[PDB]
Amino acid sequence: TDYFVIGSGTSTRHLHAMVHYLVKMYKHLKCRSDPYVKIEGKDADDWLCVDFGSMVIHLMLPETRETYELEKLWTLRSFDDQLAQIAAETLPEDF
Amino acid sequence: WRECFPLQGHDVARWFPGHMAKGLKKMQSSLKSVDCVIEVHDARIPFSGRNPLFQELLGLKPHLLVLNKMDLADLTEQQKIVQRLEEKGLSNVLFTNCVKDENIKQIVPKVMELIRCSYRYHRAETPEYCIMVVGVPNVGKSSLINSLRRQHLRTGKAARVGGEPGITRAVTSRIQVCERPLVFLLDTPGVLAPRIESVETGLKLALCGTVLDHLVGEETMADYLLYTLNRHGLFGYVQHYALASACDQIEWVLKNVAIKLRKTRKVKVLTGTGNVNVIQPDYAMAARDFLRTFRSGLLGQVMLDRDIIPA
Amino acid sequence: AVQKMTRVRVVDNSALGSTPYHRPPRCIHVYNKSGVGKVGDQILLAIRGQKKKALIVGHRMPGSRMTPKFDSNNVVLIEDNGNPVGTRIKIPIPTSLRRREGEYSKVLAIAQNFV
Amino acid sequence: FKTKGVIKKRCKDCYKVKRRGRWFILCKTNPKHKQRQ
RNA sequence: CUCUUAUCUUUAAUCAGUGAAAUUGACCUUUCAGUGAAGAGGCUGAAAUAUAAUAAUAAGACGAGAAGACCCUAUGGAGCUUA
RNA sequence: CCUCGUUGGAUCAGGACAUCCCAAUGGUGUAGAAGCUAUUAAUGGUUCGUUUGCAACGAUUAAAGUCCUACGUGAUCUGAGUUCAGACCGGAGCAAUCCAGGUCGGUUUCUAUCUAUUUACGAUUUCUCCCAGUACGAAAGGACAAGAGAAAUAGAGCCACCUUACAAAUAAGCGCUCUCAACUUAAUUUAUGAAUAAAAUCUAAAUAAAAUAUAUACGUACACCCUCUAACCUAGAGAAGGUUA
Ligand SMILES: Nc1nc2c(ncn2[C@@H]2O[C@H](COP(=O)(O)OP(=O)(O)NP(=O)(O)O)[C@@H](O)[C@H]2O)c(=O)[nH]1
Ligand SMILES: [Mg+2]
Ligand SMILES: [Mg+2]
Ligand SMILES: [Mg+2]
Ligand SMILES: [Mg+2]
Ligand SMILES: [Mg+2]
Ligand SMILES: [Mg+2]
Ligand SMILES: [Mg+2]
Ligand SMILES: [Mg+2]
Ligand SMILES: [Mg+2]
Ligand SMILES: [Mg+2]
Ligand SMILES: [Mg+2]
Ligand SMILES: [Mg+2]
Ligand SMILES: [Mg+2]
Ligand SMILES: [Mg+2]
Ligand SMILES: [Mg+2]
Ligand SMILES: [Zn+2]
Numbered sequence: 001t002d003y004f005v006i007g008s009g010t011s012t013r014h015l016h017a018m019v020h021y022l023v024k025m026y027k028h029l030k031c032r033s034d035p036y037v038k039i040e041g042k043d044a045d046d047w048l049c050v051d052f053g054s055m056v057i058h059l060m061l062p063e064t065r066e067t068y069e070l071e072k073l074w075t076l077r078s079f080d081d082q083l084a085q086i087a088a089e090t091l092p093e094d095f
Numbered sequence: 096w097r098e099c100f101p102l103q104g105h106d107v108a109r110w111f112p113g114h115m116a117k118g119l120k121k122m123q124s125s126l127k128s129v130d131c132v133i134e135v136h137d138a139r140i141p142f143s144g145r146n147p148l149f150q151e152l153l154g155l156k157p158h159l160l161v162l163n164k165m166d167l168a169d170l171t172e173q174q175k176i177v178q179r180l181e182e183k184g185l186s187n188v189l190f191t192n193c194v195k196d197e198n199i200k201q202i203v204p205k206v207m208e209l210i211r212c213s214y215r216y217h218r219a220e221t222p223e224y225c226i227m228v229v230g231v232p233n234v235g236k237s238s239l240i241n242s243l244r245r246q247h248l249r250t251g252k253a254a255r256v257g258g259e260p261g262i263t264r265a266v267t268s269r270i271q272v273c274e275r276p277l278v279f280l281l282d283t284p285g286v287l288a289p290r291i292e293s294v295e296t297g298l299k300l301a302l303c304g305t306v307l308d309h310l311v312g313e314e315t316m317a318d319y320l321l322y323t324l325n326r327h328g329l330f331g332y333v334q335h336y337a338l339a340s341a342c343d344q345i346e347w348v349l350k351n352v353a354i355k356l357r358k359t360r361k362v363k364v365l366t367g368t369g370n371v372n373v374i375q376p377d378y379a380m381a382a383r384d385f386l387r388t389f390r391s392g393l394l395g396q397v398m399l400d401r402d403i404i405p406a
Numbered sequence: 407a408v409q410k411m412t413r414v415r416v417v418d419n420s421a422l423g424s425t426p427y428h429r430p431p432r433c434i435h436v437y438n439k440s441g442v443g444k445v446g447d448q449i450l451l452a453i454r455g456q457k458k459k460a461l462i463v464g465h466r467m468p469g470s471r472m473t474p475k476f477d478s479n480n481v482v483l484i485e486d487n488g489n490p491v492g493t494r495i496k497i498p499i500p501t502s503l504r505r506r507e508g509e510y511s512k513v514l515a516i517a518q519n520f521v
Numbered sequence: 522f523k524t525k526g527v528i529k530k531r532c533k534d535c536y537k538v539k540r541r542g543r544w545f546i547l548c549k550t551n552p553k554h555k556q557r558q
Numbered sequence: 559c560u561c562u563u564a565u566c567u568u569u570a571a572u573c574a575g576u577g578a579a580a581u582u583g584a585c586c587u588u589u590c591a592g593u594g595a596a597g598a599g600g601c602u603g604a605a606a607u608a609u610a611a612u613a614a615u616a617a618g619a620c621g622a623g624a625a626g627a628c629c630c631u632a633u634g635g636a637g638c639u640u641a
Numbered sequence: 642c643c644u645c646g647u648u649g650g651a652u653c654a655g656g657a658c659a660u661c662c663c664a665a666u667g668g669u670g671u672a673g674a675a676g677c678u679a680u681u682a683a684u685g686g687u688u689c690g691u692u693u694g695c696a697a698c699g700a701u702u703a704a705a706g707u708c709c710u711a712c713g714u715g716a717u718c719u720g721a722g723u724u725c726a727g728a729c730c731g732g733a734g735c736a737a738u739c740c741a742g743g744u745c746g747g748u749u750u751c752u753a754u755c756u757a758u759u760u761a762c763g764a765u766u767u768c769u770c771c772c773a774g775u776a777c778g779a780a781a782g783g784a785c786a787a788g789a790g791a792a793a794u795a796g797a798g799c800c801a802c803c804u805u806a807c808a809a810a811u812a813a814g815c816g817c818u819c820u821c822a823a824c825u826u827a828a829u830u831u832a833u834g835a836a837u838a839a840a841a842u843c844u845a846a847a848u849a850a851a852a853u854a855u856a857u858a859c860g861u862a863c864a865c866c867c868u869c870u871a872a873c874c875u876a877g878a879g880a881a882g883g884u885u886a
Contacts, residue, residue, distance in 0.1 A: 091364050
């Protein structure tokens with residue numbers, strides 16, 4: 001995508017409201033040719049993400065944000081610490 | 096060593112093969128001709144696995160609980176256990192070893208004493224006493240029959256005895272067991288449960304051999320065995336198998352024992368570039384052998400119910 | 407094409423998918439009206455004596471032209487709520503996950519490489 | 522509409538009609554009283 | 559096995575030569591509902607209906623063959639054992 | 642008097658409605674959404690496993706209906722039992738033997754004479770989106786109908802691609818494409834209106850309508866009129882059929 005947006009929220013109630021508010025505004029704000037957008041993560045209680053055509057917004061509660069640390073991954077493309085910790089392997093015989 | 100063993104979604108043991116069903120109601124019919132009922136249960140799980148069905152279906156007659164396999168267990172608690180049993184409602188109980196024929200004399204006097212106090216009604220005039228042995232599979236019900244047969248009748252083995260759960264299939268005909276009291280024993284197939292309550296209750300029974308390890312997983316049972324063995328301080332598996340400082344990871348300990356036994360498999364591992372068959376140490380065979388030494392008793396005397404239900 | 411009892415590879419950094427307990431996870435269920443699972447199709451996984459949801463991100467069966475055919479059947483572990491269990495994916499993930507119907511944005515956020 | 526073997530008026534406002542080959546009691550006050558034969 | 563496919567050979571089928579078997583009351587040998595012994599091509603009532611081959615299927619003809627199975631009978635046998 | 646009296650699976654299904662799902666409705670202790678109960682309707686559908694004598698269990702589903710068709714169906718196949726010749730245990734008998742007691746092992750074949758049958762149709766369901774986080778509701782929560790797109794399965798076809806073969810010019814699916822209309826009608830709901838003096842009454846009164854599943858009025862397909870030594874054919878067992886500068 002062209003842009004990546006991450007937004008924190010106090011509680012699950014707050015996350016639902018803003019996600020609904022933005023979606024309502026998006027349909028109101030032109031987008032006549034552009035299609036509609038699904039709201040993803042409503043089943044989850046801590047992470048909601050809406051994938052607009054040119055923008056993807058991921059909304060999550062505070063605790064979830066630090067666990068995943070999405071900002072580091074997209075800022076540091078391939079130098080992310082967690083991605084670095086992962087390693088490749090090969091499998092020869094034991095003896 | 097890990098303080099708490101986690102489950103969070105492990106399946107509970109599933110049972111009731113057909114033979115345990117058609118046999119379960121043939122027991123009930125036999126209650127007409129039975130003067131007493133024996134419950135046989137492994138002495139390592141005094142409270143964990145006892146099938147609830149037996150008490151509900153047949154609770155009217157006098158009752159004695161037999162705790163077989165007392166030798167391969169640590170019964171230092173005993174007295175506290177006995178008091179706990181009385182609170183539950185287990186008025187009569189006594190620990191028995193059938194391979195060494197220990198304490199198998201005391202059963203007949205107690206069994207006769209219970210029948211005295213009770214009533215006999217339809218069979219009041221019969222001088223022939225018939226009683227029934229029931230329990231979860233692989234507790235020594237069939238062994239008890241033979242052991243009594245040779246301690247009193249002195250003839251020998253009359254019921255096939257095996258090292259695997261589910262050898263006795265159906266309620267068979269009567270087998271002569273004693274002569275002077277003349278008690279007769281009826282042998283019934285082991286019946287485990289429809290539901291096993293906690294999954295831990297199902298692990299504790301899997302370790303005792305009540306559950307065929309192949310519908311619970313050898314590896315999962317092995318992890319629980321290591322988890323319990325380390326907590327109880329019985330580090331006797333680090334000398335049978337050289338493990339140096341010991342460990343709390345099942346994969347590590349299983350690695351060493353597989354090396355000690357020189358066992359290897361060709362296993363298909365799934366990698367990024369495709370599937371390759373790689374020679375590997377035999378973790379599954381290690382788990383099967385590791386459980387066997389525990390069952391024989393060379394890994395130490397264990398009382399599973401010590402921790403959760405000390406009472 | 408993932409089916410029931412297929413052996414699959416956990417392409418993730420989650421603890422449950424690590425090489426310890428070498429026994430590969432096996433598929434118990436495919437969440438499709440057909441039992442065949444393709445890219446983007448959820449499945450139920452037998453992993454380490456547990457039952458966990460997973461999302462197919464690559465497989466060895468030929469697909470339509472212009473799309474990547476991988477050398478292994480790959481999956482990512484998914485929580486009951488739908489959040490991915492692992493926090494990073496390093497193996498390439500096909501870009502076709504973006505459009506197809508479903509909730510796939512969360513997984514795409516976790517994966518740096520797209521092929 | 523409960524279909525009953527024998528139809529009986531249940532209140533003052535209940536009235537009886539013969540529609541589409543059957544007898545009906547219809548009540549304006551209480552729709553519960555509607556019945557068919 | 560999901561979930562089957564392709565190819566080759568045997569068989570098949572057409573042509574030429576040779577030429578059996580169980581079987582068979584007679585047959586100009588239909589469908590439906592009724593009747594009836596759980597039962598109908600053939601009876602009752604409706605219906606259908608130019609005549610003959612060739613190749614396929616196996617629902618029916620209680621389909622055809624065996625020294626099969628089960629039960630009962632005979633002042634029928636036989637083997638075995640004894641107190 | 643103590644005892645004890647064929648059915649699974651596979652294949653292909655025909656039918657009933659006493660309806661499990663899909664569709665049309667009445668009532669409610671129906672606000673919405675979930676439910677409960679009733680009526681009409683037989684339309685197509687109604688999964689894959691674990692345990693294995695079936696009885697529970699796991700994961701799904703719009704739903705995993707109840708039944709009839711000599712277990713529907715072994716001259717289509719197959720398991721167990723009926724159940725024996727061998728052999729063991731447990732019990733009974735002096736024995737031979739026995740047990741509607743356990744177990745292990747254990748061979749029914751059929752070349753089709755007759756009837757019957759062997760060449761087309763006009764689609765079902767789910768999910769997302771929109772309506773709309775709207776209506777409703779104190780909040781919590783949370784829809785109709787109308788509209789759009791996706792899949793799945795079923796039916797019918799096809800070979801540009803992909804894939805597997807003939808290490809043949811082809812055949813296949815694991816690949817691709819296409820699928821629709823309802824004259825007329827049941828429960829039910831409206832309008833006009835008498836019997837019945839009404840600003841009554843949906844009417845086994847005369848009437849005007851709307852409203853399930855069905856189906857064939859209505860359309861597609863077929864139609865032609867017949868040279869054939871022979872050769873060839875994406876037509877085929879034979880025959881038939883097509884092609885021939
Ligand atoms: N160490 C030990 N092993 C015992 C004892 N009693 C029986 N066993 C073991 O347990 C097995 C026999 O169990 P068995 O008598 O068949 O039990 P069951 O419950 O009658 N069998 P089933 O599961 O078929 O119902 C043998 O492996 C025997 O060595 C005992 O007192 N001590
Ligand atoms: Mg000839
Ligand atoms: Mg003739
Ligand atoms: Mg004729
Ligand atoms: Mg007839
Ligand atoms: Mg006639
Ligand atoms: Mg013929
Ligand atoms: Mg026939
Ligand atoms: Mg016959
Ligand atoms: Mg006579
Ligand atoms: Mg049918
Ligand atoms: Mg009806
Ligand atoms: Mg037949
Ligand atoms: Mg053999
Ligand atoms: Mg034939
Ligand atoms: Mg709507
Ligand atoms: Zn009324």
